[PDB]
Amino acid sequence: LKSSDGESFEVEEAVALESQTIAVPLPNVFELILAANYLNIKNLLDLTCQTVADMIKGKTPEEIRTTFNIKNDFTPEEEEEVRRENQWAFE
Amino acid sequence: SFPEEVLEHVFSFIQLDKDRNSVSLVCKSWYEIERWCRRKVFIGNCYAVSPATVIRRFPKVRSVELKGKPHFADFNLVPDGWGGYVYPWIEAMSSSYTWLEEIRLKRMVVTDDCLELIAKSFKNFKVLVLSSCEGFSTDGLAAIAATCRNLKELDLRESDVDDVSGHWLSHFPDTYTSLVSLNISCLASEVSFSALERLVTRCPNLKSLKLNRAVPLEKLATLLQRAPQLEELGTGGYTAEVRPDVYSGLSVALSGCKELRCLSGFWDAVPAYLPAVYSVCSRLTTLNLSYATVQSYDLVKLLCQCPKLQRLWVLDYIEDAGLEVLASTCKDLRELRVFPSEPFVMEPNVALTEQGLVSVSMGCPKLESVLYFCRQMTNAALITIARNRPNMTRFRLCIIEPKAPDYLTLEPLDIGFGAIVEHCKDLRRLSLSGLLTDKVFEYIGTYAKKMEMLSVAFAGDSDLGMHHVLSGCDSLRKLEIRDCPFGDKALLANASKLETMRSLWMSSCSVSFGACKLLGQKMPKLNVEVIDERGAPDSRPESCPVERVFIYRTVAGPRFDMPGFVWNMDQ
Ligand SMILES: O=P(O)(O)O[C@H]1[C@H](OP(=O)(O)O)[C@@H](OP(=O)(O)O)[C@H](OP(=O)(O)O)[C@@H](OP(=O)(O)O)[C@H]1OP(=O)(O)O
């Protein structure tokens, strides 16, 4: 297995077939998550994704976007309409 | 911060409604990914939103839950025909949610047409819960049994079914084996016993079986031998000639059910046959002895065997002496409901008082949910309960006589309930009774900051009492009130509070038609519904109190299926 920075890695068939992608140049290897996904390693992807989901659960919109560095692209009215529907109808 | 594939996968791990709603509001992108992978939708008020809105926002739903009539419908205070029709929901979904798996309805009107449409549109249909629904018959049950090849749950709890005939069950075909949970306890019509026995036998994943009274005690052992993997059993009838061979067949069959945790049914229960249930006792976590009119010592014999019990529903036949035993033996008890035998008799038929609830509060450190029907109460007993159980989350106390004061001091129960809301900081539900002035509500407004649900009957002096509640109760979602001297003033003074709540119900109070009109004018996002069976509210002076008013926020606007005795106040 060759990485994106020209480096070379010695693994066995067992370890290497855990990647459905591999199953060798890997020019694309939160960075972990991108790696699980690109290499199609199912458990690692589950494990990384559940970890990220935990960073979300129980948090408000503002904090979720605080932690992941996301900016609010809802106009005030849009955010009003969605929160109201969310709360009046779906909660 | 990831490709769309990754976020969707992150979201699969988020199934709570509230967390899903928070993610939908982090940005337009998350809004989009989350709409499309949302599996379940909970609609606590079916008139709060239209089917079309739900279906277009959340196109891939496999599970929906809907609730119709408000709670006071259980107390017969919502006239027939009011609404809660699920048909439009199922029609909209019929063409959109081809892959739908679960429908859970509570207090809706469900008709045989609904059931046939469900059966025929949803091939992967697995779960039908009809909780306190009405409008359908065993014919509609027949359509589900014949057609839903994948069905895993048919749960009919407390529904009113038109009991045309018990033949519907024999429409499950012989190829059908997927049943996990069957609750036919509300059905009066006798099912074919051999059809039932053949169904239990061919269904290896059956985990919950709740029978009707028409399955007699002598047939129970036969079914149990066919389902030794059962975790919940609701018995049929529990009466028979007292015979060794009958008692021992039952004993062996039940003790062959090693996974049994929950027992219910017990209609017509004879004390001689209760012991068959004893081998199961030590692992039981739920016991529902509500239909069993056996006496206190008999209940005590059973309850001594139940160290793991977490939930008890009993009749007041338990008495205080029984509750004292419960408090000793059942250290893991989380929930106690004690129902009245003879509620239409004012003098006590049983020795069940405040002291039974006091014992339980002292002895059961995990007790957090109470429904208790008794005839007398004191402020002293309520204060002791609140001090012992600061962990209480649901406290529902019904003193049979309206407006009964503390029986030792003759004072209102303001102070005792004040102590409950003061000491139980995570109290999310309260219902009140006994003599109560505006002062209790002042305590409630001041302390009950976590309370989500409040039921009130025959209580308070003036609008200041309702005002305290609307003004102070930060987490309020449902307020239901009957027969209280609460009128126009608190309702209009606190109008915008009502947009933070699921609903407000008031019946037999002093809310005038004029107030109702005004509130409808002021608050167009509210449906303000006058429910009055005396004819047009116009034919009486504006100042005249309406029979009932039901108020609820909605994004759908005035509803399309009001009957002749219901008026919406929107302009
Ligand atoms: O969360 P809500 O929509 O306010 O529903 C509540 C909640 O039931 P859910 O399990 O559907 O959340 C109560 O349950 P608990 O929190 O006490 O476990 C339940 O009370 P019961 O335990 O008596 O079933 C009550 O039902 P009800 O009002 O008939 O007593 C019901 O409120 P709804 O009346 O709005 O369904």
Ligand SMILES: O=C(O)Cc1c[nH]c2ccccc12
């Ligand atoms: O909560 C219950 O079911 C019992 C109860 C106690 N006080 C009440 C006032 C109004 C409606 C119901 C109740």
